[PDB]
Structure formats: structure tokens, C-alpha cells
Write a protein that holds these residues in place. Structure first.
Motif, PDB file in Angstrom:
ATOM      1  N   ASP A  87       0.844  -1.187   0.000  1.00 24.59           N
ATOM      2  CA  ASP A  87       0.000   0.000   0.000  1.00 24.59           C
ATOM      3  C   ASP A  87       0.890   1.251   0.000  1.00 24.59           C
ATOM      4  OD1 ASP A  87      -2.497  -1.298  -0.139  1.00 24.59           O
ATOM      5  OD2 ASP A  87      -2.899  -1.187   2.015  1.00 24.59           O
ATOM      6  N   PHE A  88       0.333   2.365  -0.442  1.00 20.26           N
ATOM      7  CA  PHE A  88       1.055   3.614  -0.390  1.00 20.26           C
ATOM      8  C   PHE A  88       0.143   4.655   0.233  1.00 20.26           C
ATOM      9  CE2 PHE A  88      -1.502   4.328  -4.012  1.00 20.26           C
ATOM     10  CZ  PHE A  88      -1.664   5.704  -4.076  1.00 20.26           C
ATOM     11  N   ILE A  89       0.643   5.883   0.411  1.00 22.52           N
ATOM     12  CA  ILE A  89      -0.105   6.923   1.122  1.00 22.52           C
ATOM     13  C   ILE A  89      -0.374   8.127   0.246  1.00 22.52           C
ATOM     14  CG2 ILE A  89       0.005   8.596   3.004  1.00 22.52           C
ATOM     15  CD1 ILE A  89       1.752   6.280   4.438  1.00 22.52           C
ATOM     16  N   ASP A  90      -1.598   8.193  -0.244  1.00 24.25           N
ATOM     17  CA  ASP A  90      -1.995   9.216  -1.194  1.00 24.25           C
ATOM     18  C   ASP A  90      -2.627  10.429  -0.535  1.00 24.25           C
ATOM     19  OD1 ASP A  90      -4.442  10.366  -2.849  1.00 24.25           O
ATOM     20  OD2 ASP A  90      -3.048   9.571  -4.341  1.00 24.25           O
ATOM     21  N   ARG A  91      -1.933  11.558  -0.548  1.00 24.06           N
ATOM     22  CA  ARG A  91      -2.552  12.791  -0.095  1.00 24.06           C
ATOM     23  C   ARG A  91      -3.090  12.661   1.334  1.00 24.06           C
ATOM     24  NH1 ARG A  91      -5.663  12.984  -5.880  1.00 24.06           N
ATOM     25  NH2 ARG A  91      -7.016  11.499  -4.781  1.00 24.06           N
TER      26      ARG A  91
ATOM     27  N   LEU B 215     -19.261  12.527  32.149  1.00 25.74           N
ATOM     28  CA  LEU B 215     -20.180  13.308  31.286  1.00 25.74           C
ATOM     29  C   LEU B 215     -20.608  14.701  31.759  1.00 25.74           C
ATOM     30  CD1 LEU B 215     -22.795  12.013  28.813  1.00 25.74           C
ATOM     31  CD2 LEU B 215     -20.568  13.222  28.595  1.00 25.74           C
ATOM     32  N   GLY B 216     -20.200  15.704  30.987  1.00 23.08           N
ATOM     33  CA  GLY B 216     -20.771  17.033  31.070  1.00 23.08           C
ATOM     34  C   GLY B 216     -20.344  17.851  32.264  1.00 23.08           C
ATOM     35  N   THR B 217     -19.105  18.328  32.208  1.00 21.56           N
ATOM     36  CA  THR B 217     -18.554  19.217  33.219  1.00 21.56           C
ATOM     37  C   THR B 217     -19.013  20.669  33.047  1.00 21.56           C
ATOM     38  OG1 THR B 217     -16.600  19.826  31.951  1.00 21.56           O
ATOM     39  CG2 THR B 217     -16.545  17.771  33.161  1.00 21.56           C
ATOM     40  N   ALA B 218     -19.932  21.111  33.925  1.00 17.78           N
ATOM     41  CA  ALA B 218     -20.503  22.485  33.971  1.00 17.78           C
ATOM     42  C   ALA B 218     -20.360  23.365  32.704  1.00 17.78           C
ATOM     43  CB  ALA B 218     -19.938  23.238  35.168  1.00 17.78           C
ATOM     44  N   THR B 219     -19.827  24.579  32.853  1.00 19.59           N
ATOM     45  CA  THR B 219     -19.779  25.518  31.724  1.00 19.59           C
ATOM     46  C   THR B 219     -18.722  25.200  30.641  1.00 19.59           C
ATOM     47  OG1 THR B 219     -18.105  27.241  32.398  1.00 19.59           O
ATOM     48  CG2 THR B 219     -20.228  27.267  33.569  1.00 19.59           C
ATOM     49  N   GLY B 220     -19.146  24.592  29.525  1.00 16.26           N
ATOM     50  CA  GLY B 220     -18.280  24.399  28.354  1.00 16.26           C
ATOM     51  C   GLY B 220     -18.354  23.227  27.350  1.00 16.26           C
ATOM     52  N   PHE B 221     -17.225  22.954  26.687  1.00 20.06           N
ATOM     53  CA  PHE B 221     -17.215  22.110  25.480  1.00 20.06           C
ATOM     54  C   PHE B 221     -15.880  21.443  25.094  1.00 20.06           C
ATOM     55  CE2 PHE B 221     -15.807  26.171  24.071  1.00 20.06           C
ATOM     56  CZ  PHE B 221     -14.818  25.856  23.159  1.00 20.06           C
ATOM     57  N   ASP B 222     -16.009  20.352  24.337  1.00 21.18           N
ATOM     58  CA  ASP B 222     -14.898  19.608  23.744  1.00 21.18           C
ATOM     59  C   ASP B 222     -14.958  19.720  22.208  1.00 21.18           C
ATOM     60  OD1 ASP B 222     -13.334  17.430  22.660  1.00 21.18           O
ATOM     61  OD2 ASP B 222     -13.542  16.314  24.544  1.00 21.18           O
ATOM     62  N   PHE B 223     -14.319  20.739  21.637  1.00 18.39           N
ATOM     63  CA  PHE B 223     -14.398  21.027  20.185  1.00 18.39           C
ATOM     64  C   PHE B 223     -13.380  20.212  19.383  1.00 18.39           C
ATOM     65  CE2 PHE B 223     -12.869  23.572  16.534  1.00 18.39           C
ATOM     66  CZ  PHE B 223     -13.988  24.106  15.940  1.00 18.39           C
ATOM     67  N   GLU B 224     -13.763  19.778  18.187  1.00 14.86           N
ATOM     68  CA  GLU B 224     -12.889  18.929  17.380  1.00 14.86           C
ATOM     69  C   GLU B 224     -12.620  19.637  16.059  1.00 14.86           C
ATOM     70  OE1 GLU B 224     -12.544  15.702  19.194  1.00 14.86           O
ATOM     71  OE2 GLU B 224     -10.786  15.297  17.947  1.00 14.86           O
ATOM     72  N   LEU B 225     -11.347  19.875  15.749  1.00 11.48           N
ATOM     73  CA  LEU B 225     -11.017  20.517  14.474  1.00 11.48           C
ATOM     74  C   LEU B 225     -10.458  19.495  13.498  1.00 11.48           C
ATOM     75  CD1 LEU B 225     -11.497  23.067  13.214  1.00 11.48           C
ATOM     76  CD2 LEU B 225      -9.047  23.471  13.070  1.00 11.48           C
ATOM     77  N   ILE B 226     -11.014  19.472  12.302  1.00  9.47           N
ATOM     78  CA  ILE B 226     -10.749  18.363  11.431  1.00  9.47           C
ATOM     79  C   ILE B 226     -10.191  18.797  10.093  1.00  9.47           C
ATOM     80  CG2 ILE B 226     -11.736  16.250  10.517  1.00  9.47           C
ATOM     81  CD1 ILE B 226     -14.176  16.890  12.320  1.00  9.47           C
TER      82      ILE B 226
ATOM     83  N   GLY C 218      -7.320  17.004   3.221  1.00  7.99           N
ATOM     84  CA  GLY C 218      -5.901  16.656   3.177  1.00  7.99           C
ATOM     85  C   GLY C 218      -4.915  17.787   2.936  1.00  7.99           C
ATOM     86  N   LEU C 219      -4.770  18.676   3.916  1.00  7.68           N
ATOM     87  CA  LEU C 219      -3.924  19.855   3.753  1.00  7.68           C
ATOM     88  C   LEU C 219      -2.569  19.629   4.388  1.00  7.68           C
ATOM     89  CD1 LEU C 219      -6.308  22.886   4.606  1.00  7.68           C
ATOM     90  CD2 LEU C 219      -5.722  22.075   2.344  1.00  7.68           C
ATOM     91  N   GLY C 220      -2.556  19.250   5.652  1.00 11.92           N
ATOM     92  CA  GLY C 220      -1.292  18.909   6.243  1.00 11.92           C
ATOM     93  C   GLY C 220      -1.353  18.944   7.732  1.00 11.92           C
ATOM     94  N   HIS C 221      -0.689  17.959   8.323  1.00 13.39           N
ATOM     95  CA  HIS C 221      -0.544  17.921   9.754  1.00 13.39           C
ATOM     96  C   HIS C 221       0.105  19.210  10.145  1.00 13.39           C
ATOM     97  CE1 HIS C 221       1.214  17.250  13.686  1.00 13.39           C
ATOM     98  NE2 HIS C 221       2.419  17.304  13.150  1.00 13.39           N
ATOM     99  N   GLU C 222       1.113  19.637   9.388  1.00 14.31           N
ATOM    100  CA  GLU C 222       1.692  20.945   9.619  1.00 14.31           C
ATOM    101  C   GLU C 222       0.585  21.975   9.429  1.00 14.31           C
ATOM    102  OE1 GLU C 222       5.704  19.362   7.319  1.00 14.31           O
ATOM    103  OE2 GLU C 222       5.458  21.522   7.557  1.00 14.31           O
TER     104      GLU C 222
ATOM    105  N   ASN D 208      -3.479  26.249  15.962  1.00 13.27           N
ATOM    106  CA  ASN D 208      -2.834  27.449  16.461  1.00 13.27           C
ATOM    107  C   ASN D 208      -3.614  28.711  16.177  1.00 13.27           C
ATOM    108  OD1 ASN D 208      -0.495  26.857  17.897  1.00 13.27           O
ATOM    109  ND2 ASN D 208       0.598  26.333  16.006  1.00 13.27           N
ATOM    110  N   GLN D 209      -4.104  28.823  14.958  1.00 13.27           N
ATOM    111  CA  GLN D 209      -4.851  29.989  14.557  1.00 13.27           C
ATOM    112  C   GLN D 209      -6.041  30.206  15.429  1.00 13.27           C
ATOM    113  OE1 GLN D 209      -6.688  29.864  10.819  1.00 13.27           O
ATOM    114  NE2 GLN D 209      -7.349  32.017  10.965  1.00 13.27           N
TER     115      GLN D 209
END
Lengths: 50, 49, 50
Positions: free
Chosen positions: A10-14, B22-33, B37-41, B48-49
Motif C-alpha cells: 500500500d502507499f499513502i496518497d494525499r 459526562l458534562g462538566t458544567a460551563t463548556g465544550f470539547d471542540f474537534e477541528l478536522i 488533506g492539507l497537512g498535519h503541519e 494554532n490559529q
């Protein structure tokens, strides 16, 4: 690998992992004479036709 | 109090919520996705932004 | 012997792509540590049969 093709690794595409196959080009596994078209190398070291 | 300042590493003392997991008073667990496919960097700096 | 990118790209994704057809799935979340381990958590509709 020639006429069926080969699941090798397998390879890793994008950033999504995908398969990698290798098979004969179109024009070399179409008509029965294509059997003659291929070679496998022996223990004595030469290329051997099918 | 002791272990916030006085260390080279951050150290907590806490009580888990009553409502175990489950459910600690005032707030949230936000997920940024990444969804294209842009980059882990790139996504990392987006966090960060 | 694995690090994180070894872990996500050898196992995590091989798994998360076969996770088709699971009943009442709400969300899936996985760790890929540099300790070599990967952990994938699927949370379900509250009370679907465990």
C-alpha cells in the motif's frame, strides 16, 4: 502478476492509504499469442519464453 | 498552589466530576478536522490559529 | 518499535477504512502514539446493545 495483476503493498496518497497493483500493459495479455510474449529467468541464468 | 509555579512542569490536583464521565458544567470539547488533506503541519497551525 | 506515523499509516487507517456497516454509530476517534500503540473509540447511540 501479468494477466491477473498483483496486490503488492500500500502507499499513502494525499493522506489516505491506498493499494498498489502491477499488471501487464493492456496490449500484452489480450490474445493467446501473448503467452509467447513473456519470459521467466531460470536457475542457469537466462530468460525463458512461455 | 504548590505545584503550579514551583515546578518546571505543570502539575494538577483535581476531582473528577460527580457525573462520572459526562458534562462538566460551563463548556465544550471542540474537534477541528482536516476534511481535504492539507497537512498535519497545516492543520496544526490551523489549531494554532 | 513503532512511532506515531508508523502507527496511523500501518494500522489505524487499515482499520478505520474497514469500519463499514456498524449499527447506530455516532462517532469514531483514534490515538496514534509514538509508543507504538493505537486506540480507536466508537461512541454509539445511547443504549444500543453493547
Amino acid at each position: 502478476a501479468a494477466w491477473g495483476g498483483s496486490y503488492v503493498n500500500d502507499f499513502i496518497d494525499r493522506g489516505r492509504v491506498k493499494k498498489v497493483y502491477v499488471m501487464s500493459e493492456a496490449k500484452y495479455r489480450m490474445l493467446p499469442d501473448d503467452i509467447g510474449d513473456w519470459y521467466v529467468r531460470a536457475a542457469d541464468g537466462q530468460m525463458v519464453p512461455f | 498552589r504548590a505545584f503550579s509555579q514551583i515546578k518546571d512542569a505543570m502539575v494538577f490536583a483535581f476531582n473528577l466530576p460527580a457525573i462520572v464521565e459526562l458534562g462538566t458544567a460551563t463548556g465544550f470539547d471542540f474537534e477541528l478536522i482536516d476534511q481535504a488533506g492539507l497537512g498535519h503541519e497545516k492543520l496544526t497551525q490551523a489549531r494554532n490559529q | 518499535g513503532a512511532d506515531a506515523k508508523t502507527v496511523q499509516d500501518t494500522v489505524t487507517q487499515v482499520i478505520e477504512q474497514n469500519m463499514n456497516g456498524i449499527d447506530n454509530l455516532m462517532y469514531m476517534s483514534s490515538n496514534s502514539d509514538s509508543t507504538g500503540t493505537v486506540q480507536i473509540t466508537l461512541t454509539f447511540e445511547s443504549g444500543t446493545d453493547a
